[PDB]
Design a protein around this ligand. Structure first.
Ligand SMILES: Cc1cc2nc3c(=O)[nH]c(=O)nc-3n(C[C@H](O)[C@H](O)[C@H](O)COP(=O)(O)OP(=O)(O)OC[C@H]3O[C@@H](n4cnc5c(N)ncnc54)[C@H](O)[C@@H]3O)c2cc1C
Length: 450
């Protein structure tokens, strides 16, 4: 292929100067919106850093304190004045626990209530991906079936917005998905996706297809296309799909999705993310030796792409329920403002990962009289034992450990608040004036052919 599909194909690896130049005006916050976004972002990030006065205590060497402490333990003021494989497995489960909501779906669900009463929602992720065998994919299938039964019974008619949903990885459902051919995916994967989706619809819970590696985008769109035209799914708006703003294709995938929601007569649930596989995408493209990268190479370009994509999503509320997944205070503030006045619950939600967004979103989800923004947030809740945790944990380490990540820069007491929440468009134009051209690739990431 259609007009919208062909345009996705042709954007696959377009030069960054071109891709970034085209996004800029789509991403620019109008003057007054930009300033309310800055102020809100500043406030959120200020509260985050300085929850337990962490920066005001910088406002106030160590051996002296130990002596002042021992002196303060003198009870009477007068007296005082007068005076390899195992290490890896272990470190994985130790660092990883903070990102896991429970080992079983029942355990995760039984803990649902605490944050659900505060206005939080949930999307449960049965950990495990990249099925290597036919038996592996069968077992993931039954784990997903089981989870939908338990989630749906706990949802108990609350429906797709207020009630819990499930997130699935297509790589879990087909052996060797990474190299699978179109014909085998449709024969084998598609009937399992269709079956899980029919089940979710019986319980009226959301079912989201997670986005994985970029060379799987095209087959996931073929699967989505077919799925949206199932008679048993007519009139039901529970299908969800993730799109990754670090991809050059993202804006064009949105044109496609908008046309699909129209033709298939539904409102799609669309989770907009930046993306979780950047380091691997860069390595992969450098080994393939093709004309360029399917993702941006500077983090600020991804931020620009996200804002442009968020605007496009918010413009079509009859066709799309946008789910804005982020832990970045500026991104959140910019969305809040871009969504305009006269919020209604079913306009959009925020999303965050378990063990990562709680402090940001404790300022967001809840009553205005308690100082909150009163916007719903859906927590993505990984569920599994130690044997399913590895790949997810490594992605979290890369996310938390990168110096370009907001969750890393916020902990840096030396980087000032204004720089942390600086506007990405303005950042890009600043690079452009310094370097001579808009959207130049990262200086340390040359094209694969160089
Ligand atoms: C609820 C939820 C669900 C998610 N589901 C998925 C999913 O299905 N598939 C998926 O891929 N991701 C998914 N993610 C996103 C991913 O796991 C990270 O959480 C997310 O990208 C972090 O973005 P941020 O705005 O929180 O952080 P920010 O710190 O503002 O931006 C972080 C990031 O920018 C990108 N980046 C980093 N360096 C560069 C660079 N040099 N050049 C270009 N881009 C760069 C990467 O996307 C990286 O995560 C999900 C996130 C959430 C909250």
């Amino acid at each position: 292929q259609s007009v919208s599909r062909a345009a996705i194909t042709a954007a696959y690896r377009r030069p960054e100067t071109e891709a970034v130049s085209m996004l800029l005006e789509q991403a620019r916050l109008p003057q007054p919106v930009a300033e309310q976004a800055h102020k809100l972002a500043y406030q959120l990030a200020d509260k985050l850093r300085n929850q337990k006065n962490a920066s005001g205590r910088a406002g106030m060497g160590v051996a002296l304190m130990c002596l002042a402490e021992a002196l303060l333990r003198i009870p009477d003021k007068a007296t005082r004045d007068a005076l390899i494989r195992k290490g890896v497995d272990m470190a994985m489960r130790l660092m990883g626990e903070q990102f896991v909501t429970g080992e079983t779906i029942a355990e995760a669900l039984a803990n649902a209530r605490k944050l659900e009463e505060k206005g939080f929602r949930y999307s449960y992720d049965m950990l495990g991906e990249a099925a290597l065998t036919a038996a592996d994919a069968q077992a993931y299938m039954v784990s997903y079936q089981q989870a939908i039964h338990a989630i749906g019974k706990a949802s108990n008619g609350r429906g797709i917005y207020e009630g819990p949903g499930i997130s699935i990885k297509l790589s879990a459902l087909h052996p060797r998905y990474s190299r699978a051919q179109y014909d085998r995916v449709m024969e084998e994967l598609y009937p399992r996706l269709k079956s899980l989706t029919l089940l979710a619809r019986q319980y009226d819970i959301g079912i989201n297809i997670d986005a994985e590696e970029s060379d799987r985008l095209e087959i996931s769109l073929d699967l989505l296309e077919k799925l949206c035209f199932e008679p048993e799914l007519a009139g039901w708006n529970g299908i969800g799909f993730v799109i990754q703003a670090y991809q050059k294709r993202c804006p064009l995938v949105i044109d496609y999705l908008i046309d699909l929601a129209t033709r298939s007569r539904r409102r799609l649930m669309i989770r907009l993310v930046k993306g979780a596989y950047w380091d691997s995408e860069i390595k992969r493209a450098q080994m393939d030796g093709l004309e360029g990268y399917p993702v941006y190479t500077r983090k600020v370009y991804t931020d620009v792409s996200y804002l442009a994509c968020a605007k496009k999503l918010l413009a079509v509320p009859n066709l799309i329920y946008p789910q804005f997944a982020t832990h970045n205070a500026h991104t959140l503030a910019a969305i809040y403002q871009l969504a305009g006045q006269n919020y209604y619950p079913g306009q959009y939600e925020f999303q965050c990962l378990h063990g990562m967004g709680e402090p940001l979103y404790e300022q967001v989800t809840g009553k205005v009289a308690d100082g909150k923004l009163n916007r719903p947030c859906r927590i993505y809740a990984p569920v599994g034992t130690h044997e399913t945790l590895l790949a997810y944990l490594v992605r979290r380490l890369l996310e938390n450990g990168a110096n370009t990540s907001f969750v890393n820069r916020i902990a840096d007491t030396s980087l000032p608040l204004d720089e942390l929440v600086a506007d990405p468009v303005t950042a890009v134009e600043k690079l452009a004036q310094q370097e001579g051209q808009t959207g130049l690739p990262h200086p340390k990431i040359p094209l694969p052919r160089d």
